[PDB]
Nucleic acid binder design. Structure first.
Ligand SMILES: [Zn+2]
Length: 1270
DNA sequence: AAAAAAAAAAAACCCCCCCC
DNA sequence: TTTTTTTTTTTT
DNA sequence: AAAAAAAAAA
RNA sequence: UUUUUUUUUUUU
């Protein structure tokens, strides 16, 4: 074990290019401690010095840029700071701490150019209290210490003699001189004297000499100073930071890497396959060899990308050593030239990397993506853990104790395994469970095919962290066309044998701190399990196979992880139950929210296997399931260190795509046990018996007569947990009590161990209320409070208005949509007006709405930027229930639990059905009546007939009013169809197919007469045989509810097209011109299509929508006569003047038009073309639209930069904007494989720009040729 | 009689880009 | 000049 | 019928 | 810093 400390004078850290030079340089050496002198920074600039992998940065700076120091500690160093102090002027900084339980003090000092020895002596005198045997004083001393430190072999002056005497007094010696008495290496070059001297020194107490190993001076190209590396021996307390290898996506994207990697895979699979080894061990060897080859390719890539750098570095070292031996001017000139060339090439490399990053950020500058989501989101808490309460009860910091305690805790969590199989079988036998038939069990046991593997791999989410092997989903996706055969062979092997590779058993658990909880307690840490991609592929194949039948295996009461089943089914059902209990004249009911204590990790694997056997699952599928849970294990990745693996004897392996389905199956045994237990009394809502409802492990149990029912439920829960491990926290589980006598409530409190909430309980993020009359108060008022709180949090968020529009869509809209879905009750207009005011105040940053919310409320015709309409989303959510009304699915028990004292089955007969017979129904209804009222509202708004439609069901009242026998109506439904159009009307009555007369043959004559009398009537014929609009198709055609809210919202937006002013027509009025509909369509399309990135579209939206503010507008606002044009003209300051007719902006437009003339484009000098994108009918050619679009948008950016600045906007700024967009779009295109289009649209523009730019401006603005004729 | 659409009146805050 | 809010009228 | 992103619940 | 389900938005 050794510690490396590096010193370096750098002479400024202000250039954004220069700081990245530090990041690459420091990471290249990878030292334990790196210190920086002469940062040329102030106090307020400390926030800018951030380096990846070095989180411990201590910066001391003054009020002016004359000095500055910093001490940095790498993340791989076990450093515990103890004392930190900073000099006022930033000339020096010292940090004292313990590395591997050994004291070490670092004093980084940047001496002044004049009087350095006196300053160093004063610093030593001031720091005498901190000096010790483990204290190092080092940095730029600006003076040699010995004769051998000068190339001229000259003695030191009197000041340096005083400094040496002070060092001797302070018991300090030169470590570098002691280790290398005859060394002549130098770090500084004095230009006026043409001499070399060593002015950077490291000194310390002689006690450290017992640990000193070696030291050297490594010359640097960063500045004129040379770095010094000191290596010291330390006690062997090294942390085993063997970071798990991971396959980054950048390495995969390289074509040469792709070719060599596929060649290596092919060669391995052609040589290392045989009859003597199984496919599992061969697959493990394949993974190991792939990891080795990937490491080798990454290493050679790192070597080749640094080939020229390394060559110039070697030449620099040779010339520097020769100069140190004897100084010559020619060698100095050669060193200067080669250093300049190397600096230029490395600066180009840094520009390439930073431009890649900036283009990635710019393509998603304001879109719905990571840069915005992480912008609004709070800074993610570090996963490193430094303090955990141990088993004894003491607060400890020792990393080995923390690791041992956390590993023992997570091992004991998964080690409680039960072996009582007899009790398991008895419990499974006691209560009936569904069984799959032969067809479904053969569907499960069907062989795996290559197409299934391709579909599974193509569905794998990307950008997800890999498992222990470090192989990501992109590895399988890119190499799929070679990986399907051998993955298929492996899967056939595991089907035949039932043995999985050892990689399928290992998982990586990462600990995440729970927000709002104590991070010093081990029990407030969320365990997240990561799996290898192949294991996830197999598990997801099995999950899909069992998901094809999970509808039969799982009752509809459980909605978690069930496809086509939505969470709010339980919320609405629970609210309806609460309403019924409230309406009951005598209250003897209980509603429990069972809080399971880590149910996912407490389900016994043997119980899972026994349950799967009892459900009729056998063959290859059950064998594979057993093989998965044969020897599972996981290891905790704590502080980046892989801990010892511990077995998963019990619990279901999280992070597995198949795990939720297995947990649902296991919990369904308990669910059916509760439902089939007659001693547990549910709540009877007419013909619907409601006992319990499930969402994953979250369970709600409704009971009647709780005194006996709750005890029976607890007894059955204990019996279930004795065989499955499903432990519940009964003392924490919240519940309601509804009792008509307080003594009974007290007795129930005494007997039961549940805790009863007086007002609300949380359930699926929804605050269920004891009295449903307070649903709005307990669910929507806090919603507005939270929305206002987040708005205030993002009051000064650094984004434009489109960024905040997308923020509203991305963070506020989903929560509001979910709350609407859960509780779509009649909401007063006050709530919506407050929500709209809060959102709008957020959007415009407390300013007035520059662009009317009515314009942005429109579709993409407003510019592809939509402001969310919360009223329309509310209406869509309310009307969504009508779809479930029409479908009348048997699994929708939530819709049949609405209280009603009349018309028990009505909700299936409103959609496309005769109106109620003047019956006042749903008086106490909470969700259905409002949905019906809204449905009628939109139906009347459409001038539509909502009572008879081509989609009217056969089961509808339109045929049941004719006293038709049931058997006839079932026959019609089964043989013909669902809608009346299938039967036929008028001349088409039962005549659209020979099957029509066939079914007529087995129809009762009276019912057939009634059907003929009804269908052939003229009114029915016209009302049926008409083309249905989109609104009818939304609720009748699709049998799937996926994307229902989107379609209803789009249709409602089309319906509620409020009249809006068209500001493009206002623009036309400004320039005394009239635009046709073609011109407006072209302007809108240009606004939507201006550029792929959102900033350019935002600029075009701002200029076309008259977002920018005009001087006459201000004169009117202030009610004053100061309507004169800004920047000084003497003319009126209208918007068209500010954009086009301004005398101070005309030269820029003349330069632009000269550029178009150089493009051989005779575009007329008409402001519509650049300001709005409207082209004359004579210039419909699209071979140049993109180029001129980019030039005009850059001109608009430049003009907007100088909106009121009296200076004329300059052509060089316009070219600078061109090159900013050039870099952004080029790197976006090279990332998106759009090279050909990018060249085709900017090649001539780049040529013209380079021809019109002088060499000095090109060099100073980093403008140069970047693409070729490729 | 209640809900939805339209018209009239009033009040706003002299830039605009930039900013991960 | 443009936007939002309130008020008045009309229709279901 | 694909890709990407977010959010909600567990 | 996973897994599943559901929901929305944008780009064809
Ligand atoms: Zn002007």
């Amino acid at each position: 074990s050794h510690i490396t400390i590096l010193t370096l004078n750098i002479n400024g850290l202000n250039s954004a290019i220069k700081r990245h030079r530090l990041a690459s340089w420091i990471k290249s050496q990878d030292p334990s401690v790196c210190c920086i002198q002469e940062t040329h920074l102030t106090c307020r600039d400390t926030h800018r010095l951030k380096i990846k992998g070095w989180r411990k940065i201590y910066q001391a700076n003054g009020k002016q840029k004359k000095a500055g120091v910093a001490i940095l500690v790498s993340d791989k160093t076990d450093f515990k700071p103890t004392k930190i102090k900073r000099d006022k002027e930033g000339h020096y900084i010292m940090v004292k701490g313990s590395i591997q339980q050994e004291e070490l003090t670092i004093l980084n000092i940047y001496a002044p150019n004049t009087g350095a020895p006196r300053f160093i002596k004063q610093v030593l005198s001031d720091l005498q209290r901190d000096l010790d045997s483990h204290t190092l004083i080092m940095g730029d001393f600006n003076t040699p210490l010995s004769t051998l430190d000068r190339s001229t072999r000259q003695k030191v002056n009197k000041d340096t003699q005083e400094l040496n005497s002070a060092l001797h007094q302070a018991d300090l010696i030169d470590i570098y001189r002691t280790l290398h008495p005859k060394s002549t290496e130098y770090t500084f070059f004095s230009a006026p004297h043409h001499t070399y001297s060593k002015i950077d020194h490291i000194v310390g107490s002689k006690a450290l000499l017992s640990k000193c190993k070696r030291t050297e001076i490594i010359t640097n190209y960063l500045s004129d100073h040379s770095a010094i590396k000191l290596e010291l021996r330390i006690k062997n307390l090294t942390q085993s930071r063997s970071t798990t290898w991971k396959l980054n996506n950048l390495l995969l994207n390289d074509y040469w890497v792709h070719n060599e990697m596929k060649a290596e895979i092919k060669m391995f699979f052609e040589t290392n396959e045989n009859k003597d080894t199984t496919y599992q061990n061969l697959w493990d060897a394949f993974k190991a060899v792939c990891r080795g080859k990937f490491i080798a390719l990454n290493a050679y890539k790192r070597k080749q990308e640094r080939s020229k750098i390394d060559t110039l570095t070697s030449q620099l070292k040779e010339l520097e050593k020769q100069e140190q031996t004897h100084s010559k001017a020619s060698r100095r000139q050669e060193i200067t030239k080669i250093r300049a060339e190397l600096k230029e090439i490395e600066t180009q490399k840094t520009l390439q990397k930073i431009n890649e990053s900036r283009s990635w950020f710019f393509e998603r500058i304001n879109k719905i993506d990571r840069p915005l989501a992480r912008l609004i989101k709070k800074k993610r808490e570090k996963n490193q853990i430094d303090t955990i309460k141990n088993d004894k009860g003491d607060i400890t910091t020792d990393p080995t104790e923390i690791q041992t305690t956390i590993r023992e805790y997570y091992k004991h969590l998964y080690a409680n395994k039960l072996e009582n199989l007899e009790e398991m079988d008895t419990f499974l036998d006691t209560y009936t469970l569904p069984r799959l038939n032969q067809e479904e069990v053969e569907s499960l046991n069907r062989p795996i095919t290559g197409s299934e593997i391709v579909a599974i791999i193509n569905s794998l989410p990307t950008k997800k962290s890999p498992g222990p092997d470090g192989f990501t989903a992109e590895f399988y996706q890119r190499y799929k066309e070679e990986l399907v055969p051998f993955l298929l062979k492996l899967f056939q092997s595991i089907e035949k044998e039932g043995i999985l590779p050892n990689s399928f058993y290992e998982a990586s658990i990462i600990l995440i701190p729970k927000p709002g909880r104590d991070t010093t307690k081990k029990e407030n840490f969320r365990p997240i399990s990561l799996m290898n991609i192949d294991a996830k592929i197999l598990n997801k194949i099995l999950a899909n196979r069992i998901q094809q039948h999970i509808k039969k295996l799982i009752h509809h009461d459980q909605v978690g992880f069930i496809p086509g089943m939505q969470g709010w089914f339980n919320i609405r059902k629970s609210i309806n139950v609460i309403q019924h209990i409230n309406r009951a004249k005598d209250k003897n009911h209980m509603i429990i929210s069972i809080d399971a204590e880590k149910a996912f990790d407490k389900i016994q694997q043997p119980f899972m296997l026994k349950t799967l056997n009892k459900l009729g699952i056998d063959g290859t599928y059950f064998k594979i399931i057993r093989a998965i849970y044969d020897k599972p294990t996981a290891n905790i990745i704590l502080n980046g260190q892989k801990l010892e693996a511990f077995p998963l004897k019990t619990g279901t392996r999280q992070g597995c795509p198949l795990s939720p389905l297995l947990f649902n199956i296991v919990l369904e045994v308990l669910a059916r046990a509760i439902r089939q237990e007659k001693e547990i009394k549910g709540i009877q809502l007419g013909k619907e018996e409601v006992k319990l409802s499930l969402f994953a492990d979250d369970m709600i149990v409704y009971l009647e007569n709780p005194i006996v029912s709750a005890q029976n439920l607890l007894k059955l829960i204990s019996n279930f947990s004795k065989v499955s491990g499903y432990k519940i926290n009964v003392q924490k589980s919240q519940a309601f009590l509804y009792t008509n006598n307080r003594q009974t409530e007290s007795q129930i409190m005494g007997e039961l161990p549940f805790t009863i909430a007086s007002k609300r309980i949380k359930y699926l993020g929804i605050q269920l209320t004891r009295d449903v009359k307070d649903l709005f108060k307990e669910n929507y008022k806090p919603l507005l409070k939270e929305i206002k709180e987040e708005t205030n949090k993002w009051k000064n968020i650094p984004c434009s208005w489109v960024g905040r529009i997308n923020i509203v869509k991305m963070a506020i809209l989903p929560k509001v949509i979910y709350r609407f879905n859960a509780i779509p009750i009649k909401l007063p207009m006050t709530f919506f007006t407050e929500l709209e005011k809060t959102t709008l105040k957020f959007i415009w940053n407390q300013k007035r709405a520059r662009i009317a919310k009515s314009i942005l409320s429109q579709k993409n015709k407003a510019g592809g930027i939509t402001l969310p309409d919360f009223k329309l989303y509310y209406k869509a959510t309310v009307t969504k229930t009508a779809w479930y009304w029409y479908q009348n699915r048997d699994i929708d028990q939530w819709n049949r639990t609405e209280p009603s004292e009349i018309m028990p089955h009505i909700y299936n007969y409103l959609i496309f059905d005769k109106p109620e017979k003047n019956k006042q129904w749903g008086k106490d209804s909470l969700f259905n009546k409002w949905c019906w009222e809204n449905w009628l509202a939109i139906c009347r708004k459409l001038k539509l007939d909502p009572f008879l439609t081509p989609y009217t069901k056969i089961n509808s009242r339109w045929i049941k009013d004719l006293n038709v026998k049931p058997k006839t109506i079932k026959t019609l439904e089964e043989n013909l169809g669902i809608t009346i159009q299938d039967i036929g009307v008028g001349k088409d009555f039962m005549s659209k197919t020979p099957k029509a007369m066939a079914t007529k043959d087995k129809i009762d004559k009276w019912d057939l007469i009634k059907l003929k009398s009804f269908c052939t009537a003229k009114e029915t014929t016209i009302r049926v045989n008409r083309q249905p609009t989109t609104w009818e198709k939304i609720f009748a055609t699709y049998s799937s509810d996926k994307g229902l809210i989107s379609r209803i919202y789009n249709e409602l937006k089309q319906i509620y097209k409020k009249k809006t002013n068209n500001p493009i027509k206002k623009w036309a009025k400004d320039m005394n011109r009239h635009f046709s509909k073609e011109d407006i369509y072209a302007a809108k399309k240009h606004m939507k299509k201006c550029s792929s990135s959102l900033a350019i579209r935002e600029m075009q939206i701002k200029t076309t929508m008259r977002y920018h503010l005009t001087p006459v507008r201000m004169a009117i606002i202030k009610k004053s006569g100061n309507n004169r044009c800004w920047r000084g003209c003497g003319e009126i300051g209208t918007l068209l003047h500010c954009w086009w007719d301004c005398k101070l902006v005309q030269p820029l437009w003349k330069s632009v038009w000269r550029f178009l003339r150089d493009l051989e484009l005779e575009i007329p000098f008409d402001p519509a073309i650049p300001l709005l994108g409207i082209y004359p009918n004579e210039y419909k050619s699209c071979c140049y639209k993109d180029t001129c679009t980019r030039m005009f948008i850059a001109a608009l950016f430049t003009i907007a930069k100088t909106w009121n600045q009296p200076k004329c906007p300059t052509m060089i700024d316009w070219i600078k904007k061109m090159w900013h967009i050039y870099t952004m779009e080029y790197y976006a295109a090279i990332k998106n494989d759009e090279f050909i289009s990018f060249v085709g649209t900017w090649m001539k523009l780049e040529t013209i720009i380079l021809s019109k730019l002088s060499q000095e401006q090109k060099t100073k603005h980093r403008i140069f040729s970047l693409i070729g004729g490729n």
